[PDB]
Structure 1
Amino acid sequence: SRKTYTLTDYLKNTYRLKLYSLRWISDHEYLYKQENNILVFNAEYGNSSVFLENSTFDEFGHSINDYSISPDGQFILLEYNYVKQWRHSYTASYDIYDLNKRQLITEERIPNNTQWVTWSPVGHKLAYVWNNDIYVKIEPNLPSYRITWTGKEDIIYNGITDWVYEEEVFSAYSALWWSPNGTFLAYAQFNDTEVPLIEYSFYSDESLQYPKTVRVPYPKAGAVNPTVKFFVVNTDSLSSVTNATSIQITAPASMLIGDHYLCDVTWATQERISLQWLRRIQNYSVMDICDYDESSGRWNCLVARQHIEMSTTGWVGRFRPSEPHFTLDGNSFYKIISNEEGYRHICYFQIDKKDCTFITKGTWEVIGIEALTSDYLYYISNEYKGMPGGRNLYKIQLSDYTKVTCLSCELNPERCQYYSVSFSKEAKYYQLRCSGPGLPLYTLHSSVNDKGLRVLEDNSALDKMLQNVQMPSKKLDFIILNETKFWYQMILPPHFDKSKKYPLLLDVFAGPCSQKADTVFRLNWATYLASTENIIVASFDGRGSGYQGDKIMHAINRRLGTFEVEDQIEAARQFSKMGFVDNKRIAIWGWSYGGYVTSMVLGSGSGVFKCGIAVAPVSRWEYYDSVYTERYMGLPTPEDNLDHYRNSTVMSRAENFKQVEYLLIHGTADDNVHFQQSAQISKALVDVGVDFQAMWYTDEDHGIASSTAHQHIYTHMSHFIKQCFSLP
């Protein structure tokens, strides 16, 4: 008896992981939305109270997609008519509800199709973007103040990023930053005038007679990049001057010498802001620390306060320069950077001193700085057990770096080895989120002694259900190649028997700084394959992978499509040597970068793989965006790295595909890795007469995440894999 974890179970989300989403409104309380009623909790005792009743907005005439209470808790921003755009961006309508009088504001309302809205960090001021222009509202019911007039569709962006800045630089749509108390409003401006447009059809609903053409300013490798400008305006002078001037903070000269980017902006104090810039050739980065000059009204950035951060073996940062964490007085800060041993650690900076002081160990890395107090600095790292795929919360004593404590390592070592954290406004409390290898466990803690106040969610319900199913196991481990260890993970079928030979599916990504082997617990396609189809699903983090030091991460610098690819092939060999793998049924599949690698492997001539599936794959780097691509590949010019750009394409290996069963899949509306990329792969396979399978997904983007589409692609892929392994 006891059934297995079926494809339907996966697709219908029968076994759901319960979460405990919380939102800190103060240093002592947080909000917890219950799909109907949003109540506020007292961290100290856990007692609750309804903050906004379930029916408070019925008869609104619109479904509320999200709420956003202002800092002073006097107003709430109701978000509706949501319409996704790219990964983070989206458009929608907004209404402000006065809580002080249980009244909805019906005057000077925020425009329909607003692109972005943000409360000031204090009070209830509003700053929003509409038609690529920035507007500011001092009072919710009063007329807005326009800040920019240069806004222009697909050409000029004020307060919001263009496409590449959203996805690759800021991993965020917003391009404006309120100062801590809300006096100043800093924002960036992007000019995509000279940037080539990506164009693709969008079919929409059946009812559309003529397909629509989507055109998005998008710089492909080597193409013209958007240009950027930074401004700071004083919102306290809006109601006094009629057209408040936006002060521009330019340079650095070392940056203005050529193409560059604005990669980070964080306020240190009420009158101090830091700006990090990056050269197009991303091996050089510069941080400026500018102070408001009350006399000149301008913003000066002393060169003595300018910090250079470069890299000789690769690019700066994992995906971009590290973010700074200033001490309360804004005179010093903490930033993760790779030490002399190529390992990423926290080092302490003084704004006017160029040499920083490292405060963390060695053979492991700090993942991120989570909180800073007058006493300790809280951060997450993978030091525990020397497991690069594990994650824990530590705290180091600011006065004595030799004093480091792990607040999560021992809470429940068997069930929890991967943690994320969420502190209260002042770090008085913090929620710990354990995500594996056991079922997600959420707990609340007071920072005084790190005492565990209580368990917010332990997924006991789920646990009961899963004991009624032949669930698969997960093995996380390492192999040693060229005297260096490389981690991998396998999702073993129930009742694993090392004596039997199993068909293995190599789940891959292998992009720079990626990590596919961890302690995270997951209920996904692989879960079904192992549980029901008795298939071993493995992942391997080879050269180029991250969180293990630059020696490994920078291994593929300027050489994408090589080691990373070879290591996945070697991994299959290594897994075969373990004796429980069927040499005749080894498959491989990936998505995005995983698709690129899968494809490169499939067309490698290394007869290891029988079949493979590539989803939304990159086929040639000259087709992908500039920021991401050039970071690892440099420029596609003959004086730079053009040769390797051309030698690392998937099309150039078309002939080799005659010896493997291939399945190419791609959404036609993919704005990230354009359908074009697969379009050229199919065409190349056609030119050399190689048969293969294909599937396009109309109007789906890079995520192919529509409910029906999601279920269709996995259902389709299962058939392919089953057939390739002669199952069931």
Structure 2
Amino acid sequence: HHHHHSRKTYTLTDYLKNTYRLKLYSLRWISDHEYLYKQENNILVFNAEYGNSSVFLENSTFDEFGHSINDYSISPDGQFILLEYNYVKQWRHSYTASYDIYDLNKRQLITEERIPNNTQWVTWSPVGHKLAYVWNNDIYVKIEPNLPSYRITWTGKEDIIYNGITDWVYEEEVFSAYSALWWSPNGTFLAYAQFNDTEVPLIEYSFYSDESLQYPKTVRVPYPKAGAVNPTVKFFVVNTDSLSSVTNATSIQITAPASMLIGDHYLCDVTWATQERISLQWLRRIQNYSVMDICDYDESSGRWNCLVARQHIEMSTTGWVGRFRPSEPHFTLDGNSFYKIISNEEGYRHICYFQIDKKDCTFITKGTWEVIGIEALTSDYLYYISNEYKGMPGGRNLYKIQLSDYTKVTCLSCELNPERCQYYSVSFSKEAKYYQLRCSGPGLPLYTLHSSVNDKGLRVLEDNSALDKMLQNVQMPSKKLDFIILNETKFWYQMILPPHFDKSKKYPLLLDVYAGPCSQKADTVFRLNWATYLASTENIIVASFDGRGSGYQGDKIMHAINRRLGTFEVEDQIEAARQFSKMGFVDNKRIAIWGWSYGGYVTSMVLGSGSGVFKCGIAVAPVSRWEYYDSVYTERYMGLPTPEDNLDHYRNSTVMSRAENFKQVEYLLIHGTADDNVHFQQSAQISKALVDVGVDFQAMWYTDEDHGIASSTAHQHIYTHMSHFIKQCFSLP
């Protein structure tokens, strides 16, 4: 006699075994009317206007092949397909893989002049079927897929000289990519960066590997910690049409500006404007000054030239320039103008309209909200995402703005499904005739397709009704997205509330913390994660809070922690906890705090604060002191760890120095041994300090796991482990 009431909950197994799948819709636009999708593991080409799914590639072709086909890549012209296999992961983006190319018209593998094994990166020209691949740190170009490669660079040395690929920091921090190659639009020019790691110190750690391995391997990665000598970067442009089979290729060098070359600098952005015009952005090591150079190819020269009068300066007096780097330029077709997200005179990031010749721009948008990204630019409209709608920073909508009248601004996604959908993202066709919208919350992810000619709805691609059906008689948690006012300012929190939430009861509470520079933890997105389980099954409330230092709410909030990590953002996590219990449904005797990565640091700094507010906390892969983390992230917020700069605060913001206070709290410290990103060192130094002052804590290392602890088994283990620690810290039976 259950009477069809919901007695199921979202269990830990549900989360770990992926019981309730969240269906996606992952397309790849090939033309301006067609995209690709995998159905039966077949790849169908879809006509966006009609529905025409006419099988593009049967799943049964590449099993004759004899290797597991990891990913693929159709050449712009549709004439060739690149097959990726023996994929072997490295850092967040980099990896090695074998490639073959299948002649999509001759229905056969190209067996001549194959792309070598251990290839680091491969990339089509944007038009036709030119290749650009990097093998042993050198660039190679194939004009036709079955002809021999032309060697572009000869100077690549492992760990020292990188041609067309990033090194550790550029990959993680600057480009969010292994690739450092940029084809010109019609693919005449291949522009590449080149990195020099000669004097960059190495992080060494042990990789134990399969129990087969008798002697643990020592991994050595060129990794510049805050203050250490950084990599250097030269930048080149080669003309791939004048490549010669009888002469080494001439790579033309663009040097940095004079204002950059005086000290340690970076290349933080490459952007082709036209067939013959390219834009560079460079950053000083002190990341409050950057210069965009605009460079033209001089025809009689053969060389490239950036005129000083086309140099564009971006700087900040209140902090660092950009959200994590200067913003990318979006050029108008003729190359003479570009749009860019820059911070306005009120510290709000808006789209500025730049002329190649005039220093000053004009803002096409304004207000106490923020522009997230520019997504497409036609001749009449510019398409961008912002958190303007209902003045709530954790929302996302697509707007189009009229290039000829800035007051004329339509919200393309706002009114679509207002109750279900408040966090959108967009994929445009080759020339923006169609777009797929991707709604992520607060309701179930919704995937829709649109023609932009008249902004009408075409079809629902995925609506997740299968998951919706499964959830009916499941006691899911609800989200509350709201704000509290501190010192005249709105700060936004979110609570994952247990089913049948009762304001009368005093629930235990976990503070899910990240709280890094330009972070946003309080948003409109639907999630099925650990938090979901904790609320639904364990009746724990999971809360997050964006305090000083968080993103998308202006520079006043975001820069608040500039040169001052481990301060306000930490303080504001504590204040949220106070504010929450003071809301009346939180059991004070049971407030916990957990974070990964930067979140691990704040968690640890919080537990270390002697605030009395928190009972326990889990820190996963945390930063312990800032001299341990990488230069370009750290120095952005922290300056240099020198007496004549910011050493005082580097010293004053270590969790180690707070060790004594951990006596008041139950700590679980977790870290994977092969964490190349935030090194096990950071947690080894934490443990040592707690040992040194006689405080009991709980620890867990993960053999061979990196910063993700992403192994299937590892992922399931760590979450099991934390649930126990939490249930046991909360006296949950």
Q: What TM-score, normalized to structure 2?
A: 0.99
Give per-residue Cα distances to partners, 1:213-248, cap 9 Å, x unaligned: 110000000000000000000011113652121000
Give the SS at the match of 2:572: helix
Deviates more, 1:34-43 or 1:85-94: 34-43
How do 1:88-99 residues align onto structure 2 when only pairs under 5 Å count?
88-99=93-104
Give the SS at the match of 2:390: helix
* CA distance in 1 between partners of 2:41 and 2:649 (Å): 55
Give the SS at the match of 2:37: strand
Name the structure 2 match of 1:424. 429
* CA distance in 1 between partners of 2:301 and 2:130 (Å): 26
The structural deviation recorded for 1:36 is 1.6
* CA distance in 1 between partners of 2:205 and 2:340 (Å): 41
The structural deviation recorded for 1:724 is 0.4
Give the SS at the match of 1:433: strand
Give per-residue Cα distances to partners, 1:128-150, cap 9 Å, x unaligned: 00001110001110110111111
Give per-residue Cα distances to partners, 1:452-496, cap 9 Å, x unaligned: 011101000100111120001000000001110000000010000
Give the SS at the match of 2:280: strand
* CA distance in 2 between partners of 1:490 and 1:324 (Å): 37
* CA distance in 2 between partners of 1:120 and 1:290 (Å): 21
The structural deviation recorded for 1:58 is 1.7
Residues 554, 153 of structure 1: CA spacing in aligned structure 2 closer, same or farther, 3 A cutoff?
same
* CA distance in 1 between partners of 2:556 and 2:39 (Å): 46
* CA distance in 2 between partners of 1:533 and 1:107 (Å): 60
Give the SS at the match of 1:354: coil
* CA distance in 2 between partners of 1:514 and 1:625 (Å): 18
* CA distance in 2 between partners of 1:414 and 1:195 (Å): 52
Deviates more, 1:210-219 or 1:234-243: 234-243
* CA distance in 2 between partners of 1:541 and 1:579 (Å): 21
* CA distance in 1 between partners of 2:350 and 2:245 (Å): 47
The structural deviation recorded for 1:193 is 0.1
* CA distance in 2 between partners of 1:353 and 1:194 (Å): 40
How do 1:18-417 residues align onto structure 2 when only pairs under 5 Å count?
18-34=23-39, 36-239=41-244, 242-417=247-422
* CA distance in 2 between partners of 1:60 and 1:482 (Å): 65
Give per-residue Cα distances to partners, 1:273-311, cap 9 Å, x unaligned: 000000000000000000000111110101111100000
The structural deviation recorded for 1:35 is 5.2
Name the structure 1 match of 2:457. 452
* CA distance in 2 between partners of 1:100 and 1:462 (Å): 40
Residues 460, 645 of structure 1: CA spacing in aligned structure 2 closer, same or farther, 3 A cutoff?
same
Give the SS at the match of 2:500: coil
Give the SS at the match of 1:18: coil
The structural deviation recorded for 1:59 is 1.5
Give the SS at the match of 1:438: coil
Give per-residue Cα distances to partners, 1:114-171, cap 9 Å, x unaligned: 0000000000000000001110001110110111111001100000000000000111
Give the SS at the match of 1:416: coil
Residues 617, 397 of structure 1: CA spacing in aligned structure 2 closer, same or farther, 3 A cutoff?
same
Residues 35, 275 of structure 1: CA spacing in aligned structure 2 closer, same or farther, 3 A cutoff?
farther
Q: Decide whether the 8 Å contact of 2:37 with 2:44 is kept in 1.
A: yes
Give per-residue Cα distances to partners, 1:2-48, cap 9 Å, x unaligned: 21000000000000100000000000000012252001000111221
Q: Decide whether the 8 Å contact of 2:625 with 2:655 is kept in 1.
A: yes
* CA distance in 2 between partners of 1:57 and 1:601 (Å): 53
> 2:495 aligned with 1:490, yes or no?
yes
* CA distance in 2 between partners of 1:9 and 1:365 (Å): 37
Q: Decide whether the 8 Å contact of 2:140 with 2:152 is kept in 1.
A: yes
* CA distance in 1 between partners of 2:701 and 2:206 (Å): 13
Deviates more, 1:547-556 or 1:206-215: 206-215
Name the structure 2 match of 1:697. 702
Deviates more, 1:669-678 or 1:242-251: 242-251
Superposed CA RMSD in Å reads: 0.6
How do 1:504-543 residues align onto structure 2 when only pairs under 5 Å count?
504-543=509-548
Give per-residue Cα distances to partners, 1:579-628, cap 9 Å, x unaligned: 00000000000000000000000010000000000000000000000000
* CA distance in 2 between partners of 1:34 and 1:112 (Å): 30
The structural deviation recorded for 1:727 is 0.5
Give per-residue Cα distances to partners, 1:635-672, cap 9 Å, x unaligned: 00000000000000000000000110000000000000
Q: What TM-score, normalized to structure 1?
A: 1.00
Give the SS at the match of 1:533: coil
The structural deviation recorded for 1:174 is 0.4
The structural deviation recorded for 1:56 is 1.4
* CA distance in 2 between partners of 1:417 and 1:605 (Å): 39
Q: Decide whether the 8 Å contact of 2:7 with 2:473 is kept in 1.
A: yes
* CA distance in 1 between partners of 2:69 and 2:39 (Å): 14
Q: Decide whether the 8 Å contact of 2:273 with 2:331 is kept in 1.
A: yes
Deviates more, 1:28-37 or 1:68-77: 28-37
Name the structure 1 match of 2:3. none
Q: Decide whether the 8 Å contact of 2:510 with 2:542 is kept in 1.
A: yes
Give the SS at the match of 1:135: strand
Q: Decide whether the 8 Å contact of 2:87 with 2:98 is kept in 1.
A: yes
Q: Decide whether the 8 Å contact of 2:151 with 2:249 is kept in 1.
A: no
* CA distance in 2 between partners of 1:241 and 1:522 (Å): 58
Residues 35, 318 of structure 1: CA spacing in aligned structure 2 closer, same or farther, 3 A cutoff?
farther
Residues 196, 35 of structure 1: CA spacing in aligned structure 2 closer, same or farther, 3 A cutoff?
farther
Q: Decide whether the 8 Å contact of 2:329 with 2:340 is kept in 1.
A: yes
* CA distance in 1 between partners of 2:727 and 2:717 (Å): 15
> 2:556 aligned with 1:551, yes or no?
yes
* CA distance in 1 between partners of 2:181 and 2:77 (Å): 20
Give the SS at the match of 1:57: coil
* CA distance in 1 between partners of 2:38 and 2:75 (Å): 16
Give the SS at the match of 1:16: coil
Deviates more, 1:190-199 or 1:57-66: 57-66
* CA distance in 1 between partners of 2:480 and 2:621 (Å): 28
Give per-residue Cα distances to partners, 1:365-385, cap 9 Å, x unaligned: 000000000000000000000
Gaps of 5+ in 2: 1-5
Gaps of 5+ in 1: none
* CA distance in 2 between partners of 1:59 and 1:27 (Å): 33
* CA distance in 2 between partners of 1:44 and 1:3 (Å): 42
Give per-residue Cα distances to partners, 1:489-541, cap 9 Å, x unaligned: 00010000000000000000000000000000000000000000000000000
The structural deviation recorded for 1:100 is 1.5
Give per-residue Cα distances to partners, 1:663-697, cap 9 Å, x unaligned: 00000000000000000000000111111000000
* CA distance in 1 between partners of 2:81 and 2:657 (Å): 56
Give the SS at the match of 2:99: strand
The structural deviation recorded for 1:57 is 1.3
Give the SS at the match of 2:591: strand
Give per-residue Cα distances to partners, 1:341-398, cap 9 Å, x unaligned: 0000001001111000100021000000000000000000000000000000000000
Q: Decide whether the 8 Å contact of 2:150 with 2:245 is kept in 1.
A: no
Candidates 590, 593, 605, aligned match of 1:585: 590
Q: Decide whether the 8 Å contact of 2:125 with 2:132 is kept in 1.
A: yes
Identity %: 100
The structural deviation recorded for 1:251 is 2.2
* CA distance in 1 between partners of 2:283 and 2:604 (Å): 32
